[PDB]
């Protein structure tokens, strides 16, 4: 009923930078206890977003000065006085009294780190999987900042799509650098058709894509 | 330049009779040394590895010139590796620092 909305949706901010977000109200702010309906939230890896400032006009105890819960009335004001590498996530404002819990649009936060060159650790497919009629070439990329990258599974220098895709972790706790892994899924009939298997990943950190190739029957 | 015998040692010439190979004698290879095929080359690497064929030939020549205890074993034993490392020539291999002994060093 009490619709909560957020204008920003995604942004990259360096640590120690002030960020401000405002959430508005479309209906009465009355709650079960009478306080304002809004409850601030911050998404954390491995879990759901956690509450930041509930009751709207009351700043929750134990919340640092970074998050400001001074918003009162229909309009609200939340700040991020300093940014931490572990504060990356999406921010929700929502009403918690009535039936239709209306969450804000959400503002995902990503931490701005320096571009790094990932390392390559390829793994030849195990012969046990070959006995199952399928194949899996593992091409590993580690601890790189720019998550935006494209992976090409060129089988005998021929890119294939729709069966083999990529897997990228989130920002690391130690250095907030993503890691990428892609697996080439090929049937045994297609596996015997093709001899050399190559992994190609186009990454901004990479000056040129690094490709490792395995001849069929290496294992 | 090969106008006389003495220049043969200078220009590092090896006869074709037993070493017909025109490629490379890869390291860690089952390479023997022919008896009647002359190797006029006194070639030694200014860096601390002499190779295979030159390595074996120089080791046998040193064993001829000097005994087994001094000569041959000092040529290939890293015996002077501690003294080479003391003089310098530091190097890191397999994630650990280690000395490097060079042909000129063992010759000296």
């Amino acid at each position: 009923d009490i619709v909560m909305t957020q204008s920003p949706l995604s942004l990259s901010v360096t640590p120690g930078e002030p960020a401000s977000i405002s959430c508005r109200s479309s209906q009465s702010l009355l709650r079960r206890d009478g306080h304002n309906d809004l409850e601030w939230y911050l998404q954390k890896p491995g879990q759901s977003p956690q509450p930041l400032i509930y009751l709207g006009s009351t700043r929750a105890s134990g919340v640092p000065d970074r998050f400001s819960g001074s918003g009162s009335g229909t309009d609200f004001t939340l700040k991020i006085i300093r940014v931490e590498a572990e504060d990356a996530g999406t921010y929700y404002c929502m009403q918690n009294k009535q039936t239709p819990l209306t969450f804000g649009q959400g503002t995902r936060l990503e931490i701005k780190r320096t571009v790094a060159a990932p390392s390559v650790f390829i793994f030849p497919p195990s012969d046990e999987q070959l006995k199952s009629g399928t194949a899996s070439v593992v091409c590993l990329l580690n601890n790189f900042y720019p998550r935006e990258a494209k992976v090409q599974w060129k089988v005998d220098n021929a890119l294939q799509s729709g069966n083999s895709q990529e897997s990228v972790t989130e920002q690391d706790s130690k250095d907030s650098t993503y890691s990428l892994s892609s697996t080439l899924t090929l049937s045994k009939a297609d596996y015997e058709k093709h001899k050399v298997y190559a992994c190609e990943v186009t990454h901004q950190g990479l000056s040129s894509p690094v490709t490792k190739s395995f001849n069929r029957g290496e294992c | 330049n090969l106008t006389s015998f003495d220049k043969l040692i200078e220009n590092d010439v090896i006869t074709r009779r037993g070493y017909i190979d025109q490629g490379e004698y890869e390291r860690n290879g089952y390479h023997t040394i022919n008896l009647f095929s002359p190797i006029y080359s006194a070639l030694s690497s200014k860096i601390g590895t002499p190779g295979d064929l030159m390595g074996r030939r120089m080791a046998f020549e040193l064993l001829a010139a000097k005994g087994y205890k001094e000569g041959m074993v000092p040529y290939i034993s890293n015996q002077y590796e501690k003294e080479a490392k003391d003089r310098g020539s530091k190097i890191r291999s397999y994630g650990k620092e280690i000395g490097l002994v060079t042909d000129d060093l063992v010759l000296e």
Partner: protein
């Protein structure tokens, strides 16, 4: 000390990260962990554990070993 949620006529769109939460109270606002409900007629499938080894050359100062699992239906932990 329990609350009930009843789900009927399950469909693939119903797969979600379901959260029961406590509201309207200043004495209790601990954030719940929720539950994972995956809606698909496929039975859970044991993963195919493939112990991949670094057959190629290893890093200079480190040894890299990877564990690969495939063909497991349920994504819960």
């Amino acid at each position: 000390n329990t609350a009930f949620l009843q789900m009927n006529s399950l469909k693939s769109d119903d797969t979600a990260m379901y959260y029961c939460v406590i509201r309207g109270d200043v004495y209790n606002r601990q954030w719940g962990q929720g539950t994972l409900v995956t809606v698909s007629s496929a039975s859970p499938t044991s993963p195919k554990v493939f112990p991949l080894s670094l057959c190629s050359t290893q890093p200079d100062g480190n040894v890299v070993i990877a564990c690969l699992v495939q063909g497991f239906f349920p994504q819960e932990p």
